[PDB]
Amino acid sequence: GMEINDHQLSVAELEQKYQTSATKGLSASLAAELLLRDGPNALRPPRGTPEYVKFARQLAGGLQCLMWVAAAICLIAFAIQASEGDLTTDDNLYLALALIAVVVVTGCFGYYQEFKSTNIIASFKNLVPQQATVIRDGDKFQINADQLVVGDLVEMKGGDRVPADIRILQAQGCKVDNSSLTGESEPQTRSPECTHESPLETRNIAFFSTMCLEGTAQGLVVNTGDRTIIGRIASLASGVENEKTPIAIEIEHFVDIIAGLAILFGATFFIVAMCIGYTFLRAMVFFMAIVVAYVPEGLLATVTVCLSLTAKRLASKNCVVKNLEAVETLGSTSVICSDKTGTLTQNRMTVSHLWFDNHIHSADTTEDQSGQTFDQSSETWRALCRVLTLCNRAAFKSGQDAVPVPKRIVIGDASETALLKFSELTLGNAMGYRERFPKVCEIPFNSTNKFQLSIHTLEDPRDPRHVLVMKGAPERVLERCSSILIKGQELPLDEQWREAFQTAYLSLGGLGERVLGFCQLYLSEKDYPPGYAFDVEAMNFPTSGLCFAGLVSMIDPPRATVPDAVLKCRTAGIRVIMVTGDHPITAKAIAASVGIISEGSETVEDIAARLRVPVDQVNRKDARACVINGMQLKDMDPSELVEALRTHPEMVFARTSPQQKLVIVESCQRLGAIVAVTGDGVNDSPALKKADIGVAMGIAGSDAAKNAADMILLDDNFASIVTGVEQGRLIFDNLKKSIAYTLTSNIPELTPYLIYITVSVPLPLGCITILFIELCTDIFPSVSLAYEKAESDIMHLRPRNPKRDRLVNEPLAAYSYFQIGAIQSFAGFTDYFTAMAQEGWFPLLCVGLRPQWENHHLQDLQDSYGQEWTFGQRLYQQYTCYTVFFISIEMCQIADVLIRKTRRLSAFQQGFFRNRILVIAIVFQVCIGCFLCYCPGMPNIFNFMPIRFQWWLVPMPFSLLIFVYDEIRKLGVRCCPGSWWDQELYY
Amino acid sequence: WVWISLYYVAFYVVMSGIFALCIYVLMRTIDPYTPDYQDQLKSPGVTLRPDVYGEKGLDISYNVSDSTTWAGLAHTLHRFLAGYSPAAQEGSINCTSEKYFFQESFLAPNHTKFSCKFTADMLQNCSGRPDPTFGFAEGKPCFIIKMNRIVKFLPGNSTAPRVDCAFLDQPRDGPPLQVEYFPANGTYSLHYFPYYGKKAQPHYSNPLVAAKLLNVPRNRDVVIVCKILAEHVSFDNPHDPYEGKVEFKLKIQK
Ligand SMILES: Cc1nc2c3c(ccn2c1C)[C@@H](O)[C@H](O)[C@H](c1ccccc1)N3
Ligand SMILES: *[C@@H]1O[C@H](CO)[C@@H](O)[C@H](O)[C@H]1NC(C)=O
Ligand SMILES: *[C@@H]1O[C@H](CO)[C@@H](O)[C@H](O)[C@H]1NC(C)=O
Ligand SMILES: [Mg+2]
Ligand SMILES: [Rb+]
Ligand SMILES: [Rb+]
Ligand SMILES: [Rb+]
Ligand SMILES: [Rb+]
């Protein structure tokens, strides 16, 4: 926009430029034309988001890619088998079809979650159109903000949100709330003098979204809409493209192993196919069945429910997440960049400390009033509380008696609201209390006096004397004080106290707190009888020799849970940095307050002042902390930044632009960090997008920063973050527990094929039957592994190294595929030969027998028993071969699901029945297993039939062998974790 | 890096041996004469010779005037019947009991039992003599209809089981067909049942009958269903069409 040289112009120059009047405002006609020219004074949302392209994305990436390829291969195989002629190849279709179906349905489940969460977030939104008091043709009236046009004339006051970007023309004690654009937690003086050349730092521009605290100003609208400082800062954040989530990156690497193995097996057994005497055509269709057999059919569905479960558990703590992948990120996270104002602090002036009875008292600045409050038994307390309750012009909006006292809306301003919310908390019912003491004279914030003074008749009629109350800048109260309430008496304001007051004023100011002096004088009912007319102009009342009551100082206090939460994260090994736009003194204050900076750490500037040495000589390595302001951040190149970044562990950036915030996250990510940013304002939108997870404050958050966030704390409870880590850490461990289970069953599915390929035995396992394994029986058990409790103290571990610690590592698979898969293959093959040897066919006979077996012409083929059956009668046996191999898997899966409960612990310790949801799932597993076999009509529908009751028992020793063998593994890894066992045999 | 390699070997051979033990268990488990379960043998199937298959099942179509079309049909009938010759079937005994034949004990070299005998003789004209075209050159083909063997399966003391062949529809279209089977009335004698083993009766052969088709029109597609008739036979199973009945298409051209 044209913002660079708006404020530096003259008012004679501006009204030529925008063809307006600084007095009379924009003509009604032109202001209407302009709106057409420039469009509405609002911000265009990220359009171009059809409902049908939201779903298209849900079915891409990772397993999505693999499963589509795997599905496509099934169709090419059907073409090759329909070229040379293959019957009941219905299997090729059903497989390819079930692949695409899992992909689609997973995509829909994700769609509702992303849809459902966004409606939850939408309902915590305000839909009342902000208004603007405008002047057009010399008439002031109320209009909607969006209707303002560049050149308009506007006004605002206490409580008015700033309608546009306004060049200030004339301001009467106007201060305003830049906490969203800049970090600034102290209100900002607005005047028409040109404070600076950067529109960001000059004090004659009200910014587009900002909030007037007190006073009044007028000005010209200079940029409306997307052209504002708000406007161009979110154009920025659009231009920020966020990186792929950690959880997704794990799953993509995971696929490079499935794919990696697929092909090697394909190639070797395609080589074995050619070498053993097959046509290239059939060697290649086998090659294809091999790669496709490595793709897990259900892993995509089993994974995303696990995410949905924790996201549900997280939703329940007012931590609503937008996409399912972000549920894991916090557990992976190792750095947290954090905004100060609004996120860490409450952004609301609270009374922090008070000086009376020659002692400073610390108030309870928690919003839930969970902190420690101060000594209110003092006689001087009751009095200082009267002065600050009477001499307060502000008021609560009506009908908020339900809502908590800090969260109430209050008219007026914060110097005075903090005093009002304070009184309601400490005294209670302040505005009704001060109706007992009527008001006869008043002086608001004055020029010549520079103090606020009012006179009141007492409550009870037995006391006809009047009471004068004065508040104001602390020295300007003391100069008009000859007395001081101390410890039950009213002492003269001698040099002991004059020194003692100045030390306390400068003491509470050193914390950068807006502090005010308070005092009272009791007018005698002799000189001032009931009804004495007071004159403001002439000085008939006294404004001197008053009795000093005390000091009260207010500040921007941290949110209640915040100091606790930061510590709990650091013990999780998560580096906390603070990136804020506020000034350093405030920045270091809060960073001490909450935990970013620990008791005892000093910056290089601290050593230089304690040792009284120039900063250059100080060894930076000796500084556990450091502050860096933004105006000096740019001076260092990135090689300088990393130096300092890894020198001082308790880092704080102060006075930093949104882009700098982005730079920092980028510099951290560039050094291999899973970095999370935690934000409220529009100076975090860009920062929040680039972060691996962007956390928004549910209530205090600006729209952009919520819109650029992965996660949202609906109640602003920052303690949610610490749970987010714990859950994210949990499922990562529980996912690799649950993944490692589901992919063991691939090998005993493929071994039947490989053997049917190589040894040419009659087909032991059918496609229609692996689909029931992968997509019917083993899902409920798999997802139940998301219910396991932490085996170790997860919250005490360092954040997993993304380079070494991986969801699926080279010992994870090699254990699950080749070792337990082998015990399952031998379990399946042992029941395979038993099935046929007991049914007439001896094993030696089965070797090579397949061609005649599948042959549709041989209707009298002899067993090893001499007997001759037909095709269909053989088929029905092969269905049992399928069916007995199927239950041979299931009896190992029940042994398998329990095996995965703990990677490094034992079930005699933890409990076989530890969690309910796995056990209820195991019972489900067998139930369909018994329904699939002994339901009538099963053999024709699916290749399943009533097994004999003893073939159930055949694989049950192998299940025990699985039990024993891992139990001793995970009994030997934990109890002797020297080197060998943990390396090859830990997953 | 080598140390890991051995481990997979140790692991596999353990499982290998563990599996190598179960095979040895399973071979000693199972009987060598009587089927361990035989769960799909509630009713037997019926094969047909000559077995010449079309796109779906058995289709047999030849030209009488053209020796080539039907030569290969007898050139499978004759081949099949080489074991139905006395020269290679002398390793058993003649059974004229005309009733079921139960051997409780094994009496032949290497602890074996006695088998019945059946030679082309029984199929009078359809034996290769006097007609080596087995009816085909005449336009009256003979089809051999043999049932599969099931250890200790019994079709019934009542009478002999017997084949019956006919078409599917075409009642009014032409005459119902007449076949003369050999043996007459188309019956398998009772003394052949039951089967007892490939090791129990090595020199054993299935009894069969033949079907000399008389009625079949020339140059017309017909369909015939040779279905066995006994009590312990079910020729009505829709999942296995070749179960106690065999269908075949047959067109004889001139
Ligand atoms: C692991 C496994 N794979 C199959 C399989 C079939 C039967 C059993 N199978 C088993 C136990 C056939 O019906 C199919 O041709 C099918 C196939 C799939 C992709 C490419 C080529 C062929 N592959
Ligand atoms: C049968 O064969 C003879 C000689 O091969 C031929 O002349 C006659 O037309 C054939 N009949 C049919 C229907 O093809
Ligand atoms: C079979 O041959 C005999 C003599 O060899 C003859 O009497 C009889 O009619 C023939 N059967 C048929 C069906 O032609
Ligand atoms: Mg902020
Ligand atoms: Rb698979
Ligand atoms: Rb206190
Ligand atoms: Rb993000
Ligand atoms: Rb019957």
Residue numbers in the entry:
A (entry chain A): 47 to 1033
B (entry chain B): 37 to 290
Task: Cite, word for word, the article reporting this structure.
The gastric H+,K+-ATPase mediates electroneutral exchange of 1H+/1K+ per ATP hydrolysed across the membrane. Previous structural analysis of the K+-occluded E2-P transition state of H+,K+-ATPase showed a single bound K+ at cation-binding site II, in marked contrast to the two K+ ions occluded at sites I and II of the closely-related Na+,K+-ATPase which mediates electrogenic 3Na+/2K+ translocation across the membrane. One of the notable differences between HKA and NKA is the presence of Lys791 and its salt bridge partner Glu820 in HKA, which physically restrict K+-binding space at the site I position. In this work, to elucidate the molecular basis of the different K+ stoichiometry in these two pumps, we evaluated a series of NKA-mimetic mutants of HKA with increasing substitutions.
We generated the NKA-mimetic single mutant Lys791Ser (KS) and a double mutant Lys791Ser/Glu820Asp (KS/ED) of HKA and determined their crystal structures. The thermal stabilities and normalized specific ATPase activities of these two mutants are significantly reduced compared to those of wild type, suggesting the mutations destabilize the cation-binding site. Therefore, we attempted crystallization in the presence of phosphate analog beryllium fluoride (BeF) and K+-competitive acid blocker (P-CAB) BYK99, a high affinity analog of SCH28080 with a fixed ring structure, which stabilizes the molecular conformation in a luminal-open but K+-bound E2P state (BYK·K+·E2BeF). The Lys791Ser (KS) single mutant structure in the BYK·Rb+·E2BeF form was analyzed at 3.4 Å resolution. Anomalous difference Fourier maps from bound Rb+ in both mutants show unambiguously a single peak at site II, which indicates that the number of Rb+ bound to the cation-binding site in either mutant remains the same as that of wild type. Even though we achieved a 3.4 Å resolution for the KS single mutant, the electron density map cannot resolve some amino acid side chains in the cation-binding site. In particular, the electron densities corresponding to the side chains of Asn792 and Glu795 are barely discernible (red arrowhead), most likely because the mutations disturb the hydrogen-bond network in the cation binding site, destabilizing the structure. In the single KS and double KS/ED mutants, the Rb+ density at the cation-binding site is weaker than that in the P-domain at higher contour levels, reflecting an unstable cation-binding site.
